[PDB]
Coordinates of C-alpha atoms in Angstrom, one line a residue:
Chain A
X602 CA 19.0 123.3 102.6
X603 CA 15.5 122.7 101.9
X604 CA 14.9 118.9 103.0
X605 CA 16.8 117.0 105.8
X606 CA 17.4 113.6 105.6
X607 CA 18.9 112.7 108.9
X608 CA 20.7 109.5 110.4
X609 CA 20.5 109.2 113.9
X610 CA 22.1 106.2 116.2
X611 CA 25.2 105.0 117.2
X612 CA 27.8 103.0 114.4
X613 CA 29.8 101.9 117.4
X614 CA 26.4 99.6 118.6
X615 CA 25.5 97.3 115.3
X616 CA 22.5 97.8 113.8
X617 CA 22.1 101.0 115.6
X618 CA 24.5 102.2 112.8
X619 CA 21.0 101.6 110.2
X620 CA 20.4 105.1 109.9
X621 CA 23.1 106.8 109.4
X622 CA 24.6 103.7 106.8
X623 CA 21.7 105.0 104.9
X624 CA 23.3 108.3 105.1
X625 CA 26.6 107.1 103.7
X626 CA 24.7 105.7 100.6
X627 CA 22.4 108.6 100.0
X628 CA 26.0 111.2 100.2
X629 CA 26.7 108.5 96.8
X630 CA 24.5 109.4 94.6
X631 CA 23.4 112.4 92.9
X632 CA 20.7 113.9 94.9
X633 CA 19.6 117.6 93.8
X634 CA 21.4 120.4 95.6
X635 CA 18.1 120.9 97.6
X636 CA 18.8 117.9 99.8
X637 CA 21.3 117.7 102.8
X638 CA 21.7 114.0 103.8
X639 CA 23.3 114.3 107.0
X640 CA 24.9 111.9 110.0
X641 CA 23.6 113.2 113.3
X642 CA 24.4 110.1 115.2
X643 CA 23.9 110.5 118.6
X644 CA 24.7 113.6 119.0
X645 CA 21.1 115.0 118.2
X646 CA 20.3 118.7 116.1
X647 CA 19.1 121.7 117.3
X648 CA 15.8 123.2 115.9
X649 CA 16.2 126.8 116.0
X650 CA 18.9 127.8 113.2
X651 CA 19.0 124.5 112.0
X652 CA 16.2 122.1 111.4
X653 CA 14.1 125.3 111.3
X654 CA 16.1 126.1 108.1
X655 CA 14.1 122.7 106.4
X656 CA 10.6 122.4 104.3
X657 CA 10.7 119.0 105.1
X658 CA 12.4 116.3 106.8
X659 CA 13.2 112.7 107.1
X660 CA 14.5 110.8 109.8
X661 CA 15.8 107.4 109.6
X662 CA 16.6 105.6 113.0
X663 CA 16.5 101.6 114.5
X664 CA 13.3 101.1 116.7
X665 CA 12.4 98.0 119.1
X666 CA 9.2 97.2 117.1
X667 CA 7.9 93.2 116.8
X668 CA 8.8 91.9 113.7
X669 CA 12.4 90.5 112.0
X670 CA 15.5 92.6 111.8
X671 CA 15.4 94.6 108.4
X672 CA 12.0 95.6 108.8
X673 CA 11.3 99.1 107.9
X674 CA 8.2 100.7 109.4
X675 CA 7.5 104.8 107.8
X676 CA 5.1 107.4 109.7
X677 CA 4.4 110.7 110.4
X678 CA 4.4 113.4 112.4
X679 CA 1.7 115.7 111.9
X680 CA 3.4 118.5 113.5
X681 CA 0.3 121.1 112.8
X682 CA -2.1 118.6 114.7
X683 CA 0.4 119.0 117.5
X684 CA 0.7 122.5 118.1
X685 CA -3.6 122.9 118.3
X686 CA -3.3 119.7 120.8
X687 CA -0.3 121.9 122.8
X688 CA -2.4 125.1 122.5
X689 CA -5.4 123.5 123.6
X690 CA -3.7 122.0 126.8
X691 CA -2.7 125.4 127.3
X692 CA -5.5 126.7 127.9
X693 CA -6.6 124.3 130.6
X694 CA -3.0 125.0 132.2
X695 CA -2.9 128.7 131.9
X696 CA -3.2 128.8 135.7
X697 CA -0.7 126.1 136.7
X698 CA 3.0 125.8 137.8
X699 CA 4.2 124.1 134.5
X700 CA 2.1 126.1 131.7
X701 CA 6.0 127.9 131.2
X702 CA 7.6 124.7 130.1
X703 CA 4.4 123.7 127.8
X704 CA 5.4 126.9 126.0
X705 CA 9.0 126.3 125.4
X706 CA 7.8 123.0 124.1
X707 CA 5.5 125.1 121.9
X708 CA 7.7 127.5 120.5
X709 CA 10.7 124.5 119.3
X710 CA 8.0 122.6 117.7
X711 CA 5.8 125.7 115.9
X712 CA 9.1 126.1 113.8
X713 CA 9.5 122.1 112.8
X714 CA 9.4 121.6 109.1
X715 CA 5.8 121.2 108.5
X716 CA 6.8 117.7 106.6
X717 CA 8.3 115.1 109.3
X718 CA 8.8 111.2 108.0
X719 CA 10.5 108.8 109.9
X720 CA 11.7 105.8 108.8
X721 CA 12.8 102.8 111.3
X722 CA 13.8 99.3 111.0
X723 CA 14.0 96.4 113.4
X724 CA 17.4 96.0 114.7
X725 CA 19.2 92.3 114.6
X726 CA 21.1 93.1 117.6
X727 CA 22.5 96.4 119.1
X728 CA 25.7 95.3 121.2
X729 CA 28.8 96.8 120.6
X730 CA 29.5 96.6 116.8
X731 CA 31.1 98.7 113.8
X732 CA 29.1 96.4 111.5
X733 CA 25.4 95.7 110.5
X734 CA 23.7 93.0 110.8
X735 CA 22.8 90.6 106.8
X736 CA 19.3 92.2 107.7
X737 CA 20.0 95.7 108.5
X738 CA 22.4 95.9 105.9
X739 CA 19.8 94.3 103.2
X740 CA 17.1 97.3 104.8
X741 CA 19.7 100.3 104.5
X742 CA 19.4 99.8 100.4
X743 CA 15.3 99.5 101.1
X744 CA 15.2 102.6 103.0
X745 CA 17.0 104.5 100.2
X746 CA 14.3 103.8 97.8
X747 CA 11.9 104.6 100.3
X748 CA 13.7 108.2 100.6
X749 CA 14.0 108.6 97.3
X750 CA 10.3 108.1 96.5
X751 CA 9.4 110.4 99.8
X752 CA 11.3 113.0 97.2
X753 CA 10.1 111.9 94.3
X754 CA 13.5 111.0 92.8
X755 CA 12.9 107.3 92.4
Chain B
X319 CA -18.9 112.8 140.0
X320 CA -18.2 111.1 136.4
X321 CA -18.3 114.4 134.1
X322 CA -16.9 117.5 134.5
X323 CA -17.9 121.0 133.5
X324 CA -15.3 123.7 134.0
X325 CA -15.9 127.1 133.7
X326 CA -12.5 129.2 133.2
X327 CA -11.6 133.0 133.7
X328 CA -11.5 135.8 135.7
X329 CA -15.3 137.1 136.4
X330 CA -13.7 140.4 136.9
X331 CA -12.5 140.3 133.6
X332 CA -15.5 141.6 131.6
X333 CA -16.0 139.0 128.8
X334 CA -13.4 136.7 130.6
X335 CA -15.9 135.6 132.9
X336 CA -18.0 133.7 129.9
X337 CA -17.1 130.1 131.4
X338 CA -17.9 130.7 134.7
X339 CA -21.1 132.0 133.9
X340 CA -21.9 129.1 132.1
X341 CA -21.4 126.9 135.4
X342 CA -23.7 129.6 137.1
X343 CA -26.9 128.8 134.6
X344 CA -26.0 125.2 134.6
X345 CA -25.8 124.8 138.0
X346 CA -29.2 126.2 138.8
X347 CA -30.7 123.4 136.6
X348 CA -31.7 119.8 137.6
X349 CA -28.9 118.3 136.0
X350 CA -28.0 115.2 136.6
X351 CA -26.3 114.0 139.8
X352 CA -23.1 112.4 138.2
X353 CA -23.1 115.9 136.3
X354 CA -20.4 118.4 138.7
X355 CA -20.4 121.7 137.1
X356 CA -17.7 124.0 138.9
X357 CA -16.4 127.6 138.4
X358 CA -12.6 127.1 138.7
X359 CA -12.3 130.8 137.7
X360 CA -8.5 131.4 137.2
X361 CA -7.6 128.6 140.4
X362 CA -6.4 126.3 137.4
X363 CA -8.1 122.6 137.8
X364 CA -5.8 120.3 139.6
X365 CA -9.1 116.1 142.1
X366 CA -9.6 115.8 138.3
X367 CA -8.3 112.0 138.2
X368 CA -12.2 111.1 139.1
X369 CA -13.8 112.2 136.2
X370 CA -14.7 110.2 132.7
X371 CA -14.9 113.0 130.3
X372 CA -14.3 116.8 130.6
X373 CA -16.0 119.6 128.7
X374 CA -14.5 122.8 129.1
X375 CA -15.5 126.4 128.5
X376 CA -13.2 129.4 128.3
X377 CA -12.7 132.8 126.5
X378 CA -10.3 132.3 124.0
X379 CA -8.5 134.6 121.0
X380 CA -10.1 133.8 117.3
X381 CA -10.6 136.4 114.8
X382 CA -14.3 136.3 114.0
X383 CA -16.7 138.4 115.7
X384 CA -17.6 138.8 119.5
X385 CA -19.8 135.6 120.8
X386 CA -18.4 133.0 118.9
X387 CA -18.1 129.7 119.9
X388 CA -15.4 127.3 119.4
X389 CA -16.1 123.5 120.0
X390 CA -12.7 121.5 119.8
X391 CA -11.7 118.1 121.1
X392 CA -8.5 117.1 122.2
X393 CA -7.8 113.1 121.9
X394 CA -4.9 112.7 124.6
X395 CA -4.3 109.4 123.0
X396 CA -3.1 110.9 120.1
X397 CA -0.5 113.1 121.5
X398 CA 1.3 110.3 122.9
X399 CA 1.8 108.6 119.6
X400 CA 3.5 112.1 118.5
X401 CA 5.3 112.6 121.9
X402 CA 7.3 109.0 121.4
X403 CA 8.3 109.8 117.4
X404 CA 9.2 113.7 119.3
X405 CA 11.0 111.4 121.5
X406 CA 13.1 109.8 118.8
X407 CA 13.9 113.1 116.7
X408 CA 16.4 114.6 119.5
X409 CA 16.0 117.8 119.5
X410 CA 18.3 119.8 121.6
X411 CA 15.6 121.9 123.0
X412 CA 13.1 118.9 123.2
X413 CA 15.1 117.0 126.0
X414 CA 13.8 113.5 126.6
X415 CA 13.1 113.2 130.0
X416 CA 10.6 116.8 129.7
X417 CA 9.1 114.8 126.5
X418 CA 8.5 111.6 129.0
X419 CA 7.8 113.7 132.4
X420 CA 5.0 116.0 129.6
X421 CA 3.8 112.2 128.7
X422 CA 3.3 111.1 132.2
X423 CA 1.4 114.5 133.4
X424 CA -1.1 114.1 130.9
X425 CA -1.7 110.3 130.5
X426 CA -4.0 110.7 133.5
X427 CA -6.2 113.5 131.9
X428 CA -9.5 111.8 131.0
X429 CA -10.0 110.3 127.2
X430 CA -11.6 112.5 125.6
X431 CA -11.6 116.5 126.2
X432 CA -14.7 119.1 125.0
X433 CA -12.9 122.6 125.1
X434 CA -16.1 125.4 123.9
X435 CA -14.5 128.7 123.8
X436 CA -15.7 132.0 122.9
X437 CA -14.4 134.7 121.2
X438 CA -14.9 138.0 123.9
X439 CA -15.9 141.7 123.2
X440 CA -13.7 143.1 125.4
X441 CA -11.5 142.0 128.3
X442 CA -11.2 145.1 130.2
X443 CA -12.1 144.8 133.8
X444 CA -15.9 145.0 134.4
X445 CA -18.2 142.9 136.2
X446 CA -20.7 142.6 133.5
X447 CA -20.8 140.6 129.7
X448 CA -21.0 141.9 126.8
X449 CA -24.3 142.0 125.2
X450 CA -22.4 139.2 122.5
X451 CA -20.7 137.1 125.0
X452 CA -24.0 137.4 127.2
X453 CA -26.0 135.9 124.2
X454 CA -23.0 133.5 124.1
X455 CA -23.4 132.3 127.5
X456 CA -26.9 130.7 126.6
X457 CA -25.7 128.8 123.2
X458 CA -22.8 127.6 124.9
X459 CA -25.0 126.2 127.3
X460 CA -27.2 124.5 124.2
X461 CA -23.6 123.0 123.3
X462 CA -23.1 121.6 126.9
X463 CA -26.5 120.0 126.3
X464 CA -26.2 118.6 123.4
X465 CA -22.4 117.5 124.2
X466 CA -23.9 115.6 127.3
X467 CA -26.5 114.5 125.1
X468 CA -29.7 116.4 127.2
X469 CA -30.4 118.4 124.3
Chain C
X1417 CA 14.5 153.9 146.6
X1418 CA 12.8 157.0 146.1
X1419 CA 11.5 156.6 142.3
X1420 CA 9.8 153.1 141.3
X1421 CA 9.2 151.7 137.2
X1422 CA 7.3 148.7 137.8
X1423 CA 6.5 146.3 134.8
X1424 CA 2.9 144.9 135.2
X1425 CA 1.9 141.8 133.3
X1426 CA 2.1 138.5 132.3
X1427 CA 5.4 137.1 130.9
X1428 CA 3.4 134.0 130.1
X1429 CA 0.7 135.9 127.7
X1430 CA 2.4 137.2 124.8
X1431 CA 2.5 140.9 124.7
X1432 CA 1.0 141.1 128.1
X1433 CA 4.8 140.7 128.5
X1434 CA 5.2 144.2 127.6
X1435 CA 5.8 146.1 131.0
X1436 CA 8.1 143.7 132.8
X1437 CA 10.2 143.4 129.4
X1438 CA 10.6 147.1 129.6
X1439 CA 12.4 146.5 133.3
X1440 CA 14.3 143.5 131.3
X1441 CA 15.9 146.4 129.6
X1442 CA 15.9 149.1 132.2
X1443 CA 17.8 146.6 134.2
X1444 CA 20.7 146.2 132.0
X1445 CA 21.0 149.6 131.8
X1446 CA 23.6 152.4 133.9
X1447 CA 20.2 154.2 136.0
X1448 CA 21.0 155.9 138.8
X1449 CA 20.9 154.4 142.8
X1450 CA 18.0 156.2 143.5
X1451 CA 15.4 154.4 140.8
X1452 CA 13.9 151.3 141.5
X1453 CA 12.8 149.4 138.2
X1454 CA 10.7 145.9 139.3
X1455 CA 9.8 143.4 137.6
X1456 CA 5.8 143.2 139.7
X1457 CA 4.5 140.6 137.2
X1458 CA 0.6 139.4 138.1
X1459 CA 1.1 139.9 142.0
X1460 CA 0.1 143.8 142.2
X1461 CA 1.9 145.7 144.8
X1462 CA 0.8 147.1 148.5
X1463 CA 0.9 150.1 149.2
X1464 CA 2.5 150.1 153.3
X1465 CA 5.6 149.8 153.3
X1466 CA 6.6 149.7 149.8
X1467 CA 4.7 152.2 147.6
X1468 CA 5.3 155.0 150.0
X1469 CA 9.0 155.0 149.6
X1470 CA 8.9 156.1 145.9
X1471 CA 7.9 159.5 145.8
X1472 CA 7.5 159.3 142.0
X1473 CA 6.0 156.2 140.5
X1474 CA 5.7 155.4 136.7
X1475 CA 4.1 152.2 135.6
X1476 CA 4.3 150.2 132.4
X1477 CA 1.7 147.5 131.7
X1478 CA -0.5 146.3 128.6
X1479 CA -4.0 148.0 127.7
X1480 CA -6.4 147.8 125.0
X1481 CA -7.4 150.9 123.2
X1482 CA -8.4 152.1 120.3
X1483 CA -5.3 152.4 118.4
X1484 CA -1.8 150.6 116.2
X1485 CA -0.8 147.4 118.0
X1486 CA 2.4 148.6 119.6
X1487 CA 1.5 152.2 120.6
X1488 CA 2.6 153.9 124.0
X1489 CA -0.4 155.9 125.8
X1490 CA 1.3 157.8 128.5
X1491 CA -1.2 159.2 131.1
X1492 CA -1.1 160.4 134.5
X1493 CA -2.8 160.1 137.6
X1494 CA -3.7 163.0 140.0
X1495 CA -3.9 161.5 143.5
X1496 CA -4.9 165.3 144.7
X1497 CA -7.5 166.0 142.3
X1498 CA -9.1 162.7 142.4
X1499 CA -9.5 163.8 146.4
X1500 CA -11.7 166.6 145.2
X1501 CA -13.4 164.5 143.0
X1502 CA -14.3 162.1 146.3
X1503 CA -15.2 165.1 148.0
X1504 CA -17.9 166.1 145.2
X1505 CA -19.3 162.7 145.6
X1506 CA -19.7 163.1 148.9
X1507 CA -21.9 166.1 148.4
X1508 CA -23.9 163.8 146.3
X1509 CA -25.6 161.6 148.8
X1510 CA -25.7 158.5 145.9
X1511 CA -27.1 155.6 147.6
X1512 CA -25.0 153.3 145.5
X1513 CA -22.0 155.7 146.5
X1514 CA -22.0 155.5 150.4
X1515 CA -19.8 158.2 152.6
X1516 CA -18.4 155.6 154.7
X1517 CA -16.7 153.8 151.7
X1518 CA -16.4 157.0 150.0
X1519 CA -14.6 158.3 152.7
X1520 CA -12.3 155.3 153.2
X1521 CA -11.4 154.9 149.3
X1522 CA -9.8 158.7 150.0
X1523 CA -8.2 157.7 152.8
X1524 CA -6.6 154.1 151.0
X1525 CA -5.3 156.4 148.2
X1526 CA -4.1 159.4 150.3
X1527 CA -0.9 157.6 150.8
X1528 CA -0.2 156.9 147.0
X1529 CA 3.1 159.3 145.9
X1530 CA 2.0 162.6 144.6
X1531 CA 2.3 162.1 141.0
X1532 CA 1.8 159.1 139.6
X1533 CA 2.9 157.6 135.0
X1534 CA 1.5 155.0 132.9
X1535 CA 2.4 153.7 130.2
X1536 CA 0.2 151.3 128.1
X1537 CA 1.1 149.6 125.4
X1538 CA -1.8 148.4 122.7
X1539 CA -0.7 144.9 122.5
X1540 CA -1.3 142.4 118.9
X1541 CA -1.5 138.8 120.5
X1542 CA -2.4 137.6 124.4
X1543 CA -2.8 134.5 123.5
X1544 CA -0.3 132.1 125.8
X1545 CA 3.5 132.7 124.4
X1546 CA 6.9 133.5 125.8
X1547 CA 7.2 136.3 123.2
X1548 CA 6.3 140.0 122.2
X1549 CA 4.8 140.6 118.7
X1550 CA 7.4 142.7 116.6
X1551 CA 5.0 145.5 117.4
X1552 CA 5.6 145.5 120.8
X1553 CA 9.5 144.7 121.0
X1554 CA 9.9 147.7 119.0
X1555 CA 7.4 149.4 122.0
X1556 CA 9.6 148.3 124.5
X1557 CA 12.6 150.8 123.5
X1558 CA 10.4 152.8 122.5
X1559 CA 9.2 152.9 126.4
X1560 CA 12.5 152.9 127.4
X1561 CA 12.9 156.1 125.6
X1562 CA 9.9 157.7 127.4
X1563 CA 10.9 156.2 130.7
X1564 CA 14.0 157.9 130.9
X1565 CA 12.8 160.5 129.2
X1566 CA 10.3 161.1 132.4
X1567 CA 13.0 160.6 134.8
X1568 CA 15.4 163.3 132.8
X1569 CA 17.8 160.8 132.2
Chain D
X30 CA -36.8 163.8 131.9
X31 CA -33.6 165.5 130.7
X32 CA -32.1 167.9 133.4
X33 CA -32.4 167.5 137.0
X34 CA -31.8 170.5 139.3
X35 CA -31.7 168.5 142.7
X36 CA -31.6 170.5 146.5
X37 CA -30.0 168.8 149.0
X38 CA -29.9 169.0 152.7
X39 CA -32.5 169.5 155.9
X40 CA -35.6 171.5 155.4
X41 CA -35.5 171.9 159.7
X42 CA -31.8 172.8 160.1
X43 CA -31.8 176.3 159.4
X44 CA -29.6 177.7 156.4
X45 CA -29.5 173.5 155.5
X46 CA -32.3 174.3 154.0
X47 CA -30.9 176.6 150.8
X48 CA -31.0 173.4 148.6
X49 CA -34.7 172.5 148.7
X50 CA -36.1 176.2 149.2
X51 CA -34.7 176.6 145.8
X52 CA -36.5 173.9 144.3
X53 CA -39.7 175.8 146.0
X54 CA -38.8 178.7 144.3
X55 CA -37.8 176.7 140.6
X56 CA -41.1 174.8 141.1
X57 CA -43.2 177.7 141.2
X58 CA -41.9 179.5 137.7
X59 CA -42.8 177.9 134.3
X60 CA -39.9 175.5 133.5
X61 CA -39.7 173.3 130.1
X62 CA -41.5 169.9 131.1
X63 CA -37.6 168.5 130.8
X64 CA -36.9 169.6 134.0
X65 CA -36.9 168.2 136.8
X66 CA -36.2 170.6 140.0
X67 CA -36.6 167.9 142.6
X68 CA -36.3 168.2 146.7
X69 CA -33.8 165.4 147.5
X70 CA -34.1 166.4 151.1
X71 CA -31.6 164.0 153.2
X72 CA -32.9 160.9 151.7
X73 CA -30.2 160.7 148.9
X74 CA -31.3 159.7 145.4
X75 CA -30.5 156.1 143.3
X76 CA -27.8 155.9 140.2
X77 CA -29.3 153.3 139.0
X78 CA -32.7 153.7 137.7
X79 CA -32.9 157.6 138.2
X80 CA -29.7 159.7 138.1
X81 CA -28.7 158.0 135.1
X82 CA -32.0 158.7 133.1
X83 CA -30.9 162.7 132.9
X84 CA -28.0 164.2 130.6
X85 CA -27.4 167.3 132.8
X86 CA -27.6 167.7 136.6
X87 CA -27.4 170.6 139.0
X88 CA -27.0 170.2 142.9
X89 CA -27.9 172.9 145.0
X90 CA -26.4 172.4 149.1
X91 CA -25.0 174.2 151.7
X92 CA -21.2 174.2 152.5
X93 CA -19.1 176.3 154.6
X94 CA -16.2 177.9 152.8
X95 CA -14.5 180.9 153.6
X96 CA -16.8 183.8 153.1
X97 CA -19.9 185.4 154.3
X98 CA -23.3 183.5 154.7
X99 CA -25.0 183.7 151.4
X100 CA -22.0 183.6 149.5
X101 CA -22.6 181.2 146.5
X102 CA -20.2 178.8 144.9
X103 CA -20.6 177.0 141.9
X104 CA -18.1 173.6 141.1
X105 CA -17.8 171.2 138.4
X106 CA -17.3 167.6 138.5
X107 CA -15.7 166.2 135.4
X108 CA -16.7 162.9 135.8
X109 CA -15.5 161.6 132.9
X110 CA -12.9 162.5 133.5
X111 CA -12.7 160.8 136.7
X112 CA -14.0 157.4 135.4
X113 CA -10.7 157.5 133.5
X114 CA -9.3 157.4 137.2
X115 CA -10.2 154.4 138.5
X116 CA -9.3 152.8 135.3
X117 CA -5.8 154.4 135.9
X118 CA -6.4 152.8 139.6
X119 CA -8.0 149.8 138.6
X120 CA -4.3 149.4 136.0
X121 CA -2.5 149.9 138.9
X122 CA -2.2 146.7 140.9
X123 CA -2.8 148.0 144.6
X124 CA -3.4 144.9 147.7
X125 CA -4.9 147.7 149.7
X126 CA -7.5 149.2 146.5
X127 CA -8.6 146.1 145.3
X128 CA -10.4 145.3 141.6
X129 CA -13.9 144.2 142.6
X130 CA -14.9 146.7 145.1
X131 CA -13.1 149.8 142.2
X132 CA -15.1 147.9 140.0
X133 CA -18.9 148.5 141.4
X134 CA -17.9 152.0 142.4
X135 CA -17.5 152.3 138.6
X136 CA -20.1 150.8 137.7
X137 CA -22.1 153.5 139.7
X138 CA -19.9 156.9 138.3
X139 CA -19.6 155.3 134.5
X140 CA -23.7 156.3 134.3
X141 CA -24.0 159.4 136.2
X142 CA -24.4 162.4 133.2
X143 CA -21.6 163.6 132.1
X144 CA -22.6 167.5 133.1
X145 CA -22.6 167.4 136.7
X146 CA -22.8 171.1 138.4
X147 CA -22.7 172.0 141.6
X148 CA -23.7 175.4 143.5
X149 CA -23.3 175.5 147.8
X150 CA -24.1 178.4 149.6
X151 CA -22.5 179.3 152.7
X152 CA -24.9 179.2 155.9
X153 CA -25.6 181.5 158.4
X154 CA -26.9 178.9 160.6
X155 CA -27.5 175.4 160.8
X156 CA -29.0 175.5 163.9
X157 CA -32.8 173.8 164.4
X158 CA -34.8 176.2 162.5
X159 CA -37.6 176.0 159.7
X160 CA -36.2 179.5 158.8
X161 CA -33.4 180.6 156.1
X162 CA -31.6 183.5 157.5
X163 CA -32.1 186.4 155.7
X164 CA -28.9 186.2 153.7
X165 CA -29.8 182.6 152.7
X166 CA -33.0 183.7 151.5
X167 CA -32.0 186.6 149.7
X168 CA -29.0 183.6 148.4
X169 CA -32.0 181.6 146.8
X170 CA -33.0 184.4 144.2
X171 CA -29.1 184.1 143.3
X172 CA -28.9 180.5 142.9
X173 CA -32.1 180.8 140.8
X174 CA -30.5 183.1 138.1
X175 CA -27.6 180.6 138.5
X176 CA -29.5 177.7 137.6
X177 CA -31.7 179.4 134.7
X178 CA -28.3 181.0 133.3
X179 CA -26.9 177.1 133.6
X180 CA -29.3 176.3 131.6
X181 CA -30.1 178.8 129.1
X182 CA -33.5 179.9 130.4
X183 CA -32.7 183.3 131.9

């Protein structure tokens, strides 16, 4: 309970499995008590009382980026950047309908972990599948050592 | 009508009414014509499609002292990069159709935004600024200048 | 309907949200048929037709004074006296104070209720927010004690 | 310029008169040069400009009251306390007392002094006259002592 590494897709749709599969490896090894490696599938996770209860997070997911199945992409979300962007719109939307709405938004993602990674790879294909593709399985074993050197546990 | 000046608040306001009486000086001057300075007091901007670049001057909350001025640019462009990895997070409370009905409101807000704010005296209701905020008024319009390039 | 508690703010701006949180609570609560707390937000109320039925009034709204963020002023406003004031003006001959408009202001207010409660709260943030500071959630039962404490309840 | 002892009303009208035939009789002792005893007449005097430049003020008028002509009166206005009012009013969210109008008739009481006395004397007549009846008259030499007591001078 201090970083998240989260899985999110579906296992029943092929290489959509990739995230969580990484998952599965990471709950093999020895990681430090520190670190919950969890499968959120597609069932998503709340932020308040939840991800709120993270320093930092990592999500792993299958993206439709060019390239060849099994490539991993990382990047960022600068989540401090975001709330000055939200609080400047704000205040050229204090006067309309859907300023309310801009602060809900506000208020989930001024409690995000102030560290957010995300690491996707390029699908082989996505149709209904319990198994990964040669690629995607070769890129769940390189996405591990990219999680463990975001943690410095390489 | 390719740029935009904004002045925001509530005149009645006291120190509130710093934007708006930045349009006031500005539009007394020979500005030029493409130039639309407009005191939207608290009507809320809505129209705004038109314009190429927006500056925009308010009375916002900081901490230092009465007449300060905040210049701060907001690159739309950026927020959508972080609205699609929001998008692939799912969050309970950040549903994705608000995250892609957010992203479609403001992909039609111009490039680049100005936002000069400045930190009021008081708020209470009162025709008049501040002696601070009066000062304020006149190197906020220096920033405008010098934003639009003029001086 | 003869005794209003309206909550006067913005929900939108932080601890503005102070006076219509206070009717949150008062709503949820066992008050009698008679009192009428509502939620008045930014709109302001008239006066015809809807002040005149409360013949005690007692509002709650966010002001900045000098003092702790979070503390309840509780004042009250005279309508009577402030008639005598007008009257004094009168007298006066101002030329920035002119009878005609001195004479209508009386006549607007005459049909306030007799005695008239506010409560202020000193707020900590107003900058756009759904929420009150700790401050001023602790102000809001606090209020709550003084409201009812003002009806006798 | 630090106290102003103002008379009010119409020289011709009779007993309408008290205010400025006290001024006469002010402006012919040997007052501090910080007075100003000043025949306001029925032209009304400016806030702005003039009212606001003294720290005490005295009106002298006519009113009818119960009670004999000549009988004096002497009022208070607390005007700071009434300044605290309108902000009570201006608080209050009223359609029918609006903000901007409240607003300038603030702007106008938040400079008037804050010792603001006033002394009316009941008339015998208002009635075209350049006369004061004789209890009017003999009312001036009592509003005189009034005003010098006022003030510290007597």
């Amino acid at each position: 309970k201090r970083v998240l590494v989260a899985g999110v897709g579906n296992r029943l749709m092929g290489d959509d499995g990739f995230g969580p599969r990484v998952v599965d490896l990471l709950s093999s090894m020895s990681l430090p008590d520190y670190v919950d490696a969890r499968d959120i599938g597609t069932a998503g996770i709340t932020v308040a009382t939840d991800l709120e209860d993270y320093e930092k997070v990592i999500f792993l997911d299958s993206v439709e980026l060019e390239g060849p199945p099994g490539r991993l992409s990382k990047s960022i979300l600068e989540v401090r950047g975001l709330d000055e962007d939200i609080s400047q719109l704000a205040r050229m939307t204090l006067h309309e309908v859907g300023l309310e709405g801009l602060l809900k938004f506000a208020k989930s993602i001024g409690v995000l972990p102030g560290e957010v990674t995300l690491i996707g790879c390029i699908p082989r294909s996505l149709k209904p599948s319990l198994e990964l593709s040669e690629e995607v399985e070769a890129a769940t074993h390189a996405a591990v050592d990219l999680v463990l050197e975001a943690l410095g546990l390489e």
